[model samples]
Target: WAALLILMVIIPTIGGNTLVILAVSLEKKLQYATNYFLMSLAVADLLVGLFVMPIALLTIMFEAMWPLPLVLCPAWLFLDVLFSTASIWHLCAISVDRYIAIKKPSRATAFIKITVVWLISIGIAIPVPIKGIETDVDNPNNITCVLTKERFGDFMLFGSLAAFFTPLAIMIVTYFLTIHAASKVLGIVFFLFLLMWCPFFITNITLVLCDSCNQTTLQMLLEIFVWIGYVSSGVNPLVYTLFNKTFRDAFGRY
Candidate 1:
């Protein structure tokens, strides 16, 4: 399972995002403001492929044990939050960019949009490291990472709604309002995002809200969805290469 996940998710995410970055780099036609945001998204996913998944795979390989030193766990989780949140915010930025392009093209400057998205991503992720989400050595053999209701406080609720759900809602509404043709593409991307993440969030909230309930089923479901979410990084390349003709052409160039 560990080897299969590394091969299937980690390797492809790295390769796919690298190709994305290369395609954007090599093709002048692809180097628009919007593509910069796409590049940002790719970079975040690339970090996940390079840094996050390998460590996670190691944990899985150790039979859910975190074999690394205690000091590294928070740092690892911080990067995990940073990259993943940034990726989500970048998706939101892309939606906003598209909306502006269709409705107010003059305002679609890349740097400002990219800067804003990065700021939002940073804001969403910074709290994890600052407060330090809880981690404990459950036993000599098992070290568990957790964000209990007390440890995370309101940020848990706010982060779940603001970081993901709100941005997703904005994307859906804006896409429907401004770009009919592009909405189809965005819909597919959004659908996959929701499919991968919704289960995790739902399970997460259940654990948070129904704090005393039997959580064995929820734990199993969370693991499944988290794996699905990890694979979603690679899905972006498919969406870009298969659906967007310009990306397809740029990718074919070399």
Candidate 2:
């Protein structure tokens, strides 16, 4: 299962994201303000493919067990959270950029928007490793590298709202009003973003809120939603590049 899932996700994620990076790098015309966000997003997803996906596959292989050296847990969690959050923020930034491009064309400068995107991405990611400490109460020497509810408390809830739900809301409204402003391809991109991410966010909030929820069911849902999110990372390149004629032409030339 682990191998199958890992191959399925990692292969296309790396392939597609790499293509996206190369498309932007090799194609001079793709060097627009909006493409900056797309490139950043590709980088984020590429990192997930390069670094995090293998660890995630290992975690699944072990059936949610932490079989690796316990000391490495924090770093794993940090990278996992960092790229995942960064990916979400990139989408949000893309939506914001699109909104601005339509509503206030003069304000959608690449400099300001790209700067803000990086700042927000780093801001959201920096806290995970810092605040992600958890210890085994019974064995003081046994440290568990997990993002526990105790350490994070309600921060996860707020983070979910800010990171996932809020951006989703903003994108929905902004895209609705500006639907005619962009291509249907871009709109599908946003919808696909919501489809891929909504399950994970919903499940996370449920587990956080309902402490008494069935553990088995929760794990099952988490796995399913996680796979969905992973698929999202891999699919973006298709949406952003293959779906765009200019990018497709550029990609073919390369």
Candidate 3:
């Protein structure tokens, strides 16, 4: 799974998401009309790659330490939380969209919904930098960069759980309703996403709850857990959009 995850990450960042967008353009009928939300959905994870993950890959070169001077690392952390959390935000939104589209078939002002999701993501992510300046001042000598290794040890870590757990429970419930409410090829998407992210959050909660688990091996384990989430985030497009039946038909048609 680990070795395959890298291919999952790169395929979406480069081609998987690209195919989704192109697929939509290839067939603009009403049957495919609901994907407007996914248009933004596809783009959300796409931005995660552009603005977030590659920098993380670089930090890996320094063995999970911030190789740069300082200050800018927190910016990456901000993007990291924003993009990752927003990925869930949009996924949940689309699930709700599906439920409503099925139950109501009423367009729920996708613009408002999308705008709200990004705002929600920013609302959660804003604290990373707002407090980072003061905290980074306290640690000018700090060499942190990895998502788990950075300054989230404060209230931010616990607070950020709101970003993860709330959306998680909602995604699970709403997506379950979606599947139960006759969700399409969507169980694979929601299930695959959960498989990727659930373990990471579980590990995070355990690590945080434990008094002091600073063992080297434990830290290594935490590192691997985070990378697993990153790989899954990148691969989400393939599962959610690229492998979608209509998407493939459109892609091949093109």
Candidate 4:
């Protein structure tokens, strides 16, 4: 299961996301502020595939234990949080990117928006590593590596709101106003995203609030739902190829 999942994630994630970047860079007509945001989104997904998922697979292989150095856990967690947060922020930012286009657009401003998005994601995720180090996030019993269970609810709830739900809310309004202002493909991309990513946060927040659920059930759900989210990183390129003829022609050139 571990090996299979790892290959499935890494191959498509690196291949597909990189393809988007190449398509944008290699083709003239494909370059634009919105596509740049999409490319930035791909960068986050690519990094997630590159850095986050393999370490994550180890946690699965090692039975959720941080099988490497004790200090390594937080670093892994930091990348996971950073890229996932960046992914969601870019999704929202793309909607905002569309709104900017309705008014008018420039790559300079898009670069600033993309840079700011990355900068903000870093700020939001910086606490995970620092706090993970400051606190007892490392081995105590089975050498388990997860957030502090005592504060788990706090982090889970807040992170769900800040990283996932809130951006989704903004994306929804931005998208709805610009359903006239946007392509159907971008709107459908939201469905693909929400479908892929939603359950993980839901499960995380559920674990936070509900005490009656069995530990085994929670663990299984956590394991399952997370991979579901990780699967999202690779699917965007498929989404592009499936929906857009412009993307098809550009992709065909490569």
Instruction: Write the residue-wise lDDT of candidate 2 on 1-254 in tens digits.
Output: 55885687578888888888898888676676567767777877888888877876766666556666655677787677677777776676666656776778523666677677667766766777666465544342344344666677587787788778877787778777786665575666556765777888788788789878896787678777887787787676577676668877777776
* Residue 96 displacement in candidate 4 (angstroms): 2.2
Question: Model 3 over residues 1-254: C-alpha lDDT tens digits?
Answer: 54356545555576667767777666656244467777776777678766666666666655555656676877877887887888776766665666677788535676677788889888888877876543344453455554444445655456547867776777678766765653556555465665677666676676667767765656677678877787777776677664556566777776
> lDDT of all the models against the reference?
0.72, 0.71, 0.67, 0.74
Q: Score every model by TM-score.
A: 0.85, 0.84, 0.79, 0.85
Q: What is every candidate's alpha-carbon RMSD to the true fold?
A: 3.0, 3.3, 4.0, 3.0
For model 4, residues 127-170, the per-residue Cα lDDT tens digits are 77666544444453357766755745577688778898888788
Q: In candidate 2, how many Å is residue 102 off?
A: 3.0
- Give the C-alpha lDDT of model 1: 0.72
The model with the greatest lDDT is 4
Q: Give lDDT: candidate 4, residue 154.
A: 75
Per-residue accuracy of model 1 over 1-254 as CA lDDT, tens digit each? 55884577567788788888898787777665656767887887788888887877776667766677666767888787777877776766666756666776323677777777778878888888777645444453565765566787577777888877887788778767865646565555555654567777767777778867776767778777877887885576456655777777777678
Please tell me which model should have the higher lDDT, number 2 or number 4: 4
The worst-scoring run of ten residues by lDDT in candidate 3 lies at 133-142
Give me candidate 3's TM-score against the actual structure: 0.79
Clashes of 4: 1
